[PDB]
Design a protein around this ligand. Sequence first.
Ligand SMILES: CC(=O)N[C@H]1[C@H]([C@H](O)[C@H](O)CO)O[C@@](O)(C(=O)O)C[C@@H]1O
Ligand SMILES: *[C@@H]1O[C@H](CO)[C@@H](O)[C@H](O)[C@H]1NC(C)=O
Ligand SMILES: *[C@@H]1O[C@H](CO)[C@@H](O)[C@H](O)[C@H]1NC(C)=O
Lengths: 172, 319
Amino acid sequence: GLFGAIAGFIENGWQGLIDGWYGFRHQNAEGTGTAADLKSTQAAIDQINGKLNRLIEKTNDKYHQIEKEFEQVEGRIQDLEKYVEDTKIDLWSYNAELLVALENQHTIDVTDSEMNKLFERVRRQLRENAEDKGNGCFEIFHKCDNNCIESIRNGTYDHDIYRDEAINNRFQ
Amino acid sequence: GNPVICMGHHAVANGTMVKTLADDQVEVVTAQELVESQNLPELCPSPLRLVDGQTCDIINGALGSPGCDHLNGAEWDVFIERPNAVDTCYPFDVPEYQSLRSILANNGKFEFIAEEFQWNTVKQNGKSGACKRANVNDFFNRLNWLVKSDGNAYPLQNLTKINNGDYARLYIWGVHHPSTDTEQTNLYKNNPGGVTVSTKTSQTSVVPNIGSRPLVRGQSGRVSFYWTIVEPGDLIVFNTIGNLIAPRGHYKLNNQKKSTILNTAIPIGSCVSKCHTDKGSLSTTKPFQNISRIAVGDCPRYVKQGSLKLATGMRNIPE
Ligand SMILES: CC(=O)N[C@H]1[C@H]([C@H](O)[C@H](O)CO)O[C@@](O)(C(=O)O)C[C@@H]1O
Ligand SMILES: *[C@@H]1O[C@H](CO)[C@@H](O)[C@H](O)[C@H]1NC(C)=O
Ligand SMILES: *[C@@H]1O[C@H](CO)[C@@H](O)[C@H](O)[C@H]1NC(C)=O
């Protein structure tokens, strides 16, 4: 995808992440954990369900049309009837082919995008207390127990609490 | 400083392949098939009104051939016409066959209004062995075969019907073609015969055609059928010196014609669906279908592809 997160600096996905599309995996002094992120997950799902609904959206409600099957050739009028239908089918087949390719391209970029937005959200929360390891992970330069980790996940982490400790650990 | 927090995304063991602009096999976590490739083995009698012609195609139904009485008064969204339909009456052709068939199917009903035609001295109700009704010789019950009087006379016919109703009328009439000159005189008398049907702004004139044709149900003669539409405020005039297969009235035409016809051998069932193909009804919410270009109702659009998968999830990168 355009952002290079999924199948990019994020090496692979997590099969263990079963209650969300995106999430957090951490390690601290008291253990490890995986938790889904609701906002990013819902953002992706909403956009994909939006596409699905616009596809279901419209109407091909047709009754009296033209004959489309013929026993024997008749000439001029039959030729035109067959050419009209063959032309229509090719144009609609083209539309279908292009639509799915465009939508899929976009869907993949949207999901790559939402992965990157989540990473960037957390990056900004952490300020100067952490460093990007390069694989979608941050090294956090202060003790961060389960309540600290949860504060990051739910967006209430206050970087100023830990800043002195973190700066001292990063440099010097 | 040493704890770590990683941001990531889900995956499954095996996803589904989809196409993009740049890649024809991309694995994603979930996908949705957009092409319906599965049909019911029956036609759904609801919510659309289907009328099964059974052994009568719609033309024989209009004409009132033997075995078509069940189509009397019928109203349809879709007339179901069967491939194994049988001619059970006098051998005929319709010069603009598909146009008459189209008008009848589109109109969407068989509502016949009997009218009486004071034909002069000519005999009426001619029958035939090619058109058996319980083995008694009979004829199309919407038509009246006119033949010469007992006293060796077929006078000029000159009859008029005026339309002061609030609907357009469909009159179906015909011209009989004898096999020989003796046949012509033995029925008509006059030779040649001739029919002229006209309205205020239109007309039609037919010269009968005498000649030996292949035997069909023991006959060499033929009938050619025609029609005339009579708008409100218009009227129709029948003129003949012979060979007229007269109408017994007219069909009622709907002002708005919204119905159609579907030729298929598929049985009518008990399911519910608003989309019918000649292969059977579709029951689906998919936007496309590859089952048949012949489709009527509220249907997915017909396409050539057997499958088109829409990604409904991110790229699947397991482990
Ligand atoms: C008006 C009338 O009586 N029709 C007679 C017809 C017609 O003269 C021919 O079919 C025209 O070709 O011939 C019959 O052999 C038939 O078909 O049963 C006897 C029948 O009574
Ligand atoms: C009969 O023909 C005459 C002239 O040929 C015409 O004036 C008259 O309207 C016709 N009658 C009917 C009932 O068609
Ligand atoms: C429709 O597609 C299916 C595969 O999804 C295929 O098996 C079938 O033959 C196709 N029908 C056609 C091409 O009429």
